[PDB]
Design a protein around this ligand. Structure first.
Ligand code: MG
Length: 246
DNA sequence: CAGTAC
DNA sequence: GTACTG
């Protein structure tokens, strides 16, 4: 029963096979064992108390409600703010393991200062229940990983990610968050072949690489207003989100 | 490293 | 593949 036990532990958020193997050696076999005796990060502690809820997929309708709960609270600061859900949701899946929401503003300035106030707003509402990786202040983008829950009876806690980008990077951001994961690797593995690089920030050309293929030059950023431009500059037929489910 | 996001 | 914090 070792293999089932490792799986049991691995389904905790913030716990992988290394920690599960450690917990197993300590003699833990149940979630209760982990809760009473094991040393936990705040993350792992949160994932342990939402273990059941976090295992469930959600109907995309509930995902929609979550996107609007974020969009409303966002536009309460600036009406011109854009909020797009880019998970399994954008790819059209009937179910979502989590909700991923991208946020930007067309003017390219008003996105600033929103991140902290938006999270604060959601917390007051009682929408955001716990924070995991409460922070990322990467470049011009910001990322939040957290736990939300819709108001009402019989509601499960859901995993919620929020990212905020400048409009100039909105295309590469949507691409990255929309996925899929295997699609992103494929696309970026390919750009690498063409002497280019792809990230959530920008598509770049003239990326220097050495004989080993290691990147030693960052190259230069190509302006990509929309997703379709990124596909074009990479010599690829544009794929709709539903065609990116690899 | 380990775990995570796509 | 790229890239973040625990
Ligand atoms: Mg896990």
């Amino acid at each position: 029963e070792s293999v089932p036990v490792l799986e049991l532990f691995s389904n905790i958020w913030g716990a992988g096979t290394k920690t599960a193997q450690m917990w197993y050696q300590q003699g833990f076999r149940s979630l209760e064992d982990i809760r009473s005796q094991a040393s936990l990060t705040t993350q792992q502690a949160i994932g342990l108390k939402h273990y059941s809820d976090f295992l469930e997929r959600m109907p995309r309708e509930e995902a929609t409600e979550i996107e609007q709960t974020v969009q409303k609270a966002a536009q309460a600061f600036n009406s011109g703010l854009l909020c797009v859900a880019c998970g399994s949701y954008r790819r059209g899946k009937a179910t979502c393991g989590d909700v991923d929401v991208a946020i930007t503003h067309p003017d390219g300035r008003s996105h600033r200062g929103i991140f902290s106030r938006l999270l604060d707003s959601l917390r007051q509402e009682g929408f955001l229940t716990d924070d995991l990786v409460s922070q990322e202040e990467n470049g011009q983008q910001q990322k939040y990983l957290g736990v939300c829950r819709l108001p009402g009876p019989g509601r499960r806690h859901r995993r919620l990610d929020i990212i905020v980008v400048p409009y100039s990077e909105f295309a590469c951001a949507l691409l990255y968050f929309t996925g899929s994961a295997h699609f992103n690797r494929s696309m970026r593995a390919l750009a690498k072949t063409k002497g280019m690089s792809l990230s959530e920030h920008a598509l770049s050309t003239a990326v220097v690489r050495n004989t080993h293929g290691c990147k030693v030059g960052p190259g230069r950023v190509l302006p990509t207003p929309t997703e379709k431009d990124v596909f074009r500059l990479l010599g690829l037929p544009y794929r709709e989100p539903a065609e990116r489910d690899w």
